[PDB]
Amino acid sequence: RLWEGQDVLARWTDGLLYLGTIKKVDSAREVCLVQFEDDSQFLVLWKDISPEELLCCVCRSETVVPGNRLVSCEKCRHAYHQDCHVPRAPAPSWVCRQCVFAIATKRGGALKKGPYARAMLGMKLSLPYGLKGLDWDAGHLSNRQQSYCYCGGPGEWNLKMLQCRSCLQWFHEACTQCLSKPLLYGDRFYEFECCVCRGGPEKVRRLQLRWVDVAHLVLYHLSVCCKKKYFDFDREILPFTSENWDSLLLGELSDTPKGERSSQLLSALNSHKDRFISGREIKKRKCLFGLHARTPPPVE
Template structure:
């Protein structure tokens, strides 16, 4: 057939509806004839005009009702041969197209028009799939399990297909219908049903006996803060404690004797003081002696106590206990003595 390069009407003069699916002049195709529900039509992707599939030379078999899974350019737009290629279809798209074609045929026929038309799985659905395999499923081979794939597509897409079991129980087994008879679109047919997230509950693994024992040891060690020491370290600690106790017992006695001696020497000095001031010094010295009992003296400083000068540092006052061999011992006491 010689390609048609001109149309018998002016395409630009046609008045189309908003969806560009029909025109008021009812002029279509190369032939210029009108639209017919009993004839399938295909649309050019360039000029958007519709053509009867029987008039398109590149189409060897008339299209099914609702078939939109192709790319087509008419010869008027190409000014050469027509361009016609099939798109790769998913299984659910092919099954949906088959059911739409069967439903459309029933609607165009005379007779009772129920809400949904149900079709038999093997005798009608699978038979039409097999007849149009090279057009719809041209990209894959027909294997032995393809009917199982069709059945899976029907049963796993409840938003697209209705099972006869829901209407007639066991008597409707093997019967299927379209949920909606709206014209197919590439977006709607490719849309998948929403998947519900399922959370798997994992069983807890029972711990082994070794793990339980290690956990018990970890828990016990967490609350046991006593240091681990050797017997030799314990013996040294005992000796240090004994020396420290001796130190604490003897140190206050030494400080008291040195303080009393310092008070006696101070009383015999060149400067004479009243009895009241002397009694105040004695009282303050006693407080200083009591405070020294609260201090902790290590065993390392035991040898330096008698010969060195001991200073008690306070905020605004200082108690100095000085011991020398040649000069008399003196005690200088200031008020508000606080030993640190």
């Protein structure tokens, strides 16, 4: 089982594996308190906790049935039932699902080319959990099981995740292989389709943003990153927009004079007082703007 002081790998909300130390276990709620390298402590579900062996770690048991030899991975040396693994193992060099992801996943998108890129793509054709049996909230944003993506790990929809238009499941940025630019926080202006529904490589299409969308997305992204509310337009908001203009994928708005960019953006910030709060409300300069509610920009 699991114990205190035990060093474990924990799958974080970004789909990546981080090495941590167990500080406390709770079998009542099936949760684990894990401390990481930066001395931070977070509650981790046991499904995301990962501890020359002889047992199958998946089914907690040995079997008799022929055809499914207990195969061990080359990297993690865990013993897998040939049919408790997804999709299914060759009997005897074999790399299990979790290690294929561990090697292939990366911030800003996983590997596109290489043996492991093609390996994960084969893995991404199937899900290691019951998708149909998932419990969603009204907005279809969260799980009760906290199971998302191809990996089956935790995640927050507003923190660098894409939603498949077909199955409505959320997928980590680090687990996708279709993106050309890094995701901003709260960016839902995409038309995405996963590998499972497609039976092949993912397909993604960037939606056309309006100026009010650009202002809201940038302000929300800055708010999450800098952990504050009010941002100066000339010193913070516009420079960020200019420095990362190419990564924003703004379509037709790309060919707009920087002089008019400032005008269009400043105009949207002052007009939409349902979304934005100027510096007037807190007795600062009017060029300061912050979100009314710390929420991602809504899609039409």
